[PDB]
Amino acid sequence: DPIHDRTSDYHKYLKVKQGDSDLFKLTVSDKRYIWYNPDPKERDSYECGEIVSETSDSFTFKTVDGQDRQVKKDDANQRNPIKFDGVEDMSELSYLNEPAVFHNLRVRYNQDLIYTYSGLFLVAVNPFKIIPIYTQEMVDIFKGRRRNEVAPHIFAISDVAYRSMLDDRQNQSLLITGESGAGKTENTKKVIQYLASVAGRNQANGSGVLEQQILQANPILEAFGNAKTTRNNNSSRFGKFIEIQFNSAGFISGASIQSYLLEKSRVVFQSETERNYHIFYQLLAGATAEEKKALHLAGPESFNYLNQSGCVDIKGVSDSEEFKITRQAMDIVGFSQEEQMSIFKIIAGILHLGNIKFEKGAGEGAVLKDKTALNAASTVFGVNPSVLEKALMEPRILAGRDLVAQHLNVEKSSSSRDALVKALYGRLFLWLVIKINNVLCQERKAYFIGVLDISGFEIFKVNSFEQLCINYTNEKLQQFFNHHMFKLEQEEYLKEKINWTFIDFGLDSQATIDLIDGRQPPGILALLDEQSVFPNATDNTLITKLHSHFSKKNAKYEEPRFSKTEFGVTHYAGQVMYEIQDWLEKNKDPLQQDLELCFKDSSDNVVTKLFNDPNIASRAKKGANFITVAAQYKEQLASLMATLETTNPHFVRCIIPNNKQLPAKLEDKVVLDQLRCNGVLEGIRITRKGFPNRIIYADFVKRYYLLAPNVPRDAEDSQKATDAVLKHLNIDPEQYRFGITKIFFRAGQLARIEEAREQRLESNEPPMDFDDDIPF
Ligand SMILES: Oc1c(Cl)cc(Cl)cc1-c1[nH]c(Br)c(Br)c1Br
Numbered sequence: 001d002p003i004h005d006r007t008s009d010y011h012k013y014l015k016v017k018q019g020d021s022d023l024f025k026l027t028v029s030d031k032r033y034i035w036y037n038p039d040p041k042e043r044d045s046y047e048c049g050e051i052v053s054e055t056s057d058s059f060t061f062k063t064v065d066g067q068d069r070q071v072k073k074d075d076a077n078q079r080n081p082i083k084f085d086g087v088e089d090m091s092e093l094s095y096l097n098e099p100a101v102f103h104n105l106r107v108r109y110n111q112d113l114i115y116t117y118s119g120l121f122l123v124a125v126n127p128f129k130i131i132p133i134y135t136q137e138m139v140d141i142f143k144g145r146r147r148n149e150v151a152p153h154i155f156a157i158s159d160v161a162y163r164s165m166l167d168d169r170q171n172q173s174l175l176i177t178g179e180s181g182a183g184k185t186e187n188t189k190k191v192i193q194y195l196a197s198v199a200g201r202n203q204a205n206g207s208g209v210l211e212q213q214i215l216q217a218n219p220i221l222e223a224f225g226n227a228k229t230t231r232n233n234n235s236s237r238f239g240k241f242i243e244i245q246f247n248s249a250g251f252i253s254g255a256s257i258q259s260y261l262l263e264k265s266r267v268v269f270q271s272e273t274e275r276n277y278h279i280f281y282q283l284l285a286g287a288t289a290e291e292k293k294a295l296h297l298a299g300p301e302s303f304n305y306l307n308q309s310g311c312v313d314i315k316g317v318s319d320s321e322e323f324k325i326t327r328q329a330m331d332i333v334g335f336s337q338e339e340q341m342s343i344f345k346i347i348a349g350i351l352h353l354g355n356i357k358f359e360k361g362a363g364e365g366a367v368l369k370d371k372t373a374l375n376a377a378s379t380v381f382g383v384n385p386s387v388l389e390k391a392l393m394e395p396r397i398l399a400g401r402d403l404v405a406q407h408l409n410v411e412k413s414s415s416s417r418d419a420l421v422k423a424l425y426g427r428l429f430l431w432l433v434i435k436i437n438n439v440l441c442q443e444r445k446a447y448f449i450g451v452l453d454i455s456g457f458e459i460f461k462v463n464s465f466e467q468l469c470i471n472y473t474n475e476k477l478q479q480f481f482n483h484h485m486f487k488l489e490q491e492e493y494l495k496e497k498i499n500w501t502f503i504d505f506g507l508d509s510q511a512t513i514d515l516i517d518g519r520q521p522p523g524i525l526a527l528l529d530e531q532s533v534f535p536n537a538t539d540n541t542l543i544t545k546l547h548s549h550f551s552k553k554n555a556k557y558e559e560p561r562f563s564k565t566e567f568g569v570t571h572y573a574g575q576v577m578y579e580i581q582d583w584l585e586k587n588k589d590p591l592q593q594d595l596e597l598c599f600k601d602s603s604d605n606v607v608t609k610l611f612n613d614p615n616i617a618s619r620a621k622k623g624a625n626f627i628t629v630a631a632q633y634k635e636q637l638a639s640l641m642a643t644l645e646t647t648n649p650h651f652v653r654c655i656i657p658n659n660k661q662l663p664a665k666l667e668d669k670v671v672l673d674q675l676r677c678n679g680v681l682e683g684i685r686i687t688r689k690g691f692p693n694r695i696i697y698a699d700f701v702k703r704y705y706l707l708a709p710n711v712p713r714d715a716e717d718s719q720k721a722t723d724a725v726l727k728h729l730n731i732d733p734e735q736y737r738f739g740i741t742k743i744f745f746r747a748g749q750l751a752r753i754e755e756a757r758e759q760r761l762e763s764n765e766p767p768m769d770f771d772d773d774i775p776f
């Protein structure tokens with residue numbers, strides 16, 4: 001058995017490597033150690049010192065040099081006995097403290113053990129290198145194994161969710177948290193791969209295509225939805241909830257992707273060193289010379305949308321090659337060759353739109369002296385160029401009921417062009433998702449495991465509305481963790497009156513959430529909205545308004561003294577300063593109807609669908625106005641979260657090792673920040689101090705049969721029959737607890753002590769068979 005064979009890749013790649021005779025000498029030492037800060041200023045840089053003496057309330061210890069230092073036992077971070085180094089579940093540590101927990105993660109990390117359990121949930125420290133642990137061989141190992149049986153792995157957390165779906169007939173979710181680049185998306189992929197493989201169909205082998213189409217749906221989105229940021233070379237610029245769908249039997253019956261909050265602005269702007277969406281570079285570098293001809297393509301550096309960041313390629317990525325992967329993913333999903341070429345027309349069209357140069361005419365309004373870019377765009381889109389031109393520079397609006405032709409300046413014309421671009425891109429992306437969803441979902445699900453892959457927390461020199469939305473989302477995901485680990489958990493203990501004294505885990509980012517999406521009193525999004533449909537409002541009246549509501553009034557809010565255009569929100573993962581510029585327009589998300597008119601007329605079957613389909617091109621009307629982006633997204637998010645509350649959540653906490661995207665460099669301050677703000681220690685603490693597993697009194701007749709005074713699945717009393725099978729082995733009384741309608745087990749008694757009763761090789765047929773058919 002590979003898991004027991006020290007030779008296996010399993011053992012080689014997933015297990016702590018065997019310590020040597022020298023390590024054994026140290027492991028049996030009677031010496032004790034403490035984690036301390038050599039520099040009290042740098043509280044996240046720790047050294048190990050030896051405890052040399054102790055008083056009633058103090059330890060004295062040697063620093064890395066020979067100096068002696070004293071500390072209150074109350075304030076001491078004791079080092080766990082080294083036998084614990086590498087331990088797979090940190091709820092097992094004797095001492096649960098920051099340097100201890102970080103140290104354990106460090107030991108596992110140093111030998112490419114990136115997964116470690118922390119009580120109920122999984123921690124995943126990004127390796128930033130490939131590790132051979134996701135082969136079909138690895139899947140196989142994990143198929144069906146109990147969490148305690150196999151090493152920590154994304155596959156194991158996935159299998160558990162799967163088993164729990166089947167055993168409880170309840171929908172599950174894999175919530176994968178992390179700041180940008182921490183590993184959310186790679187782990188999402190593994191979750192799907194694994195589920196796809198473990199619950200996929202062979203059936204004589206000619207129908208498994210559904211599962212290949214599920215797998216293939218993600219490389220498509222990734223090419224249109226991902227881009228290099230300063231924080232991640234493959235940053236997800238949209239969030240996604242993936243439903244993997246199962247039939248009654250337990251097999252995969254389909255999948256459905258809900259996408260969130262595509263970063264439309266990236267298409268027309270990217271900050272230094274960053275990249276537009278992969279698709280633009282893939283196209284340009286991977287098109288046939290004849291496609292380059294039909295689309296009037298040329299190099300990255302020929303396009304304003306691709307040539308401002310100073311970066312057109314990503315180290316170790318071939319765009320020409322990724323392009324082949326995308327095309328193949330589009331084939332496998334079912335995108336017809338016309339559909340695909342339309343898609344690249346739209347991509348090519350966007351690039352040309354970007355090259356349109358507006359200039360000042362005689363008057364104040366703009367003029368288009370060189371129509372090269374305009375014509376190439378219209379050609380590719382199949383729209384009338386002089387109609388598009390007039391729609392760009394001279395859109396018509398109502399003025400009362402009068403029809404008036406605008407003459408936009410250079411600045412307004414450029415912006416409107418950008419708006420057309422972002423609408424184009426955003427609708428295309430939404431279409432791609434719609435197309436995929438329709439291919440994958442062809443069976444009424446019986447159950448699902450939802451996999452959440454959002455854009456992770458991020459901070460840049462300049463943070464705009466997109467970031468506020470991203471970090472608010474991450475803020476809510478974390479509160480969801482807070483809620484299930486601590487709030488719901490204890491509230492239960494209270495209900496069941498199991499004599500639990502409430503603990504405040506000091507983790508609640510509700511105030512921050514409220515500050516953002518609060519209705520009454522109104523939060524940022526509400527004021528943004530109010531201001532968005534106030535006809536005279538500016539970015540400036542907006543920040544003034546925000547300042548007036550929250551400055552020195554909201555503890556999570558800050559009006560900076562160094563700027564008039566920025567406001568600070570204190571998030572769980574840190575304070576973020578947000579630049580107000582353009583918020584109103586971003587929230588209104590306006591597009592001249594003359595542009596829409598111009599494109600509804602496109603001769604292209606895909607472009608026309610982007611503009612004529614009400615489920616793609618239509619906008620919800622919030623009374624007299626269109627629904628704002630803020631309101632719409634608050635609404636999508638609440639819905640997601642409402643769906644999540646109905647599932648049984650499993651948490652994977654991804655952790656970025658550093659900010660350099662380097663393997664083998666675990667930066668303690670970086671990791672500890674995440675460990676703190678994730679509430680990792682608090683999550684371990686609740687699982688240790690508490691009673692995770694609790695079954696109703698009635699159904700307690702479940703794994704427990706005559707392993708004590710004769711008592712089969714029957715009994716007339718419920719609170720009596722309970723204490724029965726337990727006392728036989730005399731299993732510790734304070735190691736469990738009797739509540740109103742349930743029986744709780746401290747830190748998993750079903751596994752800890754229950755290893756003779758259940759999980760045995762005897763106790764079934766061996767203790768019955770001594771005198772079968774031979775008793776005289
Ligand atoms: O309809 C839009 C318009 Cl008119 C302007 C802009 Cl900037 C974006 C979208 C958009 N983006 C995404 Br993603 C979806 Br779905 C939609 Br609709």
Ligand SMILES: [Mg+2]
Pocket residue numbers: 184185186234235236454455
């Ligand atoms: Mg991602």
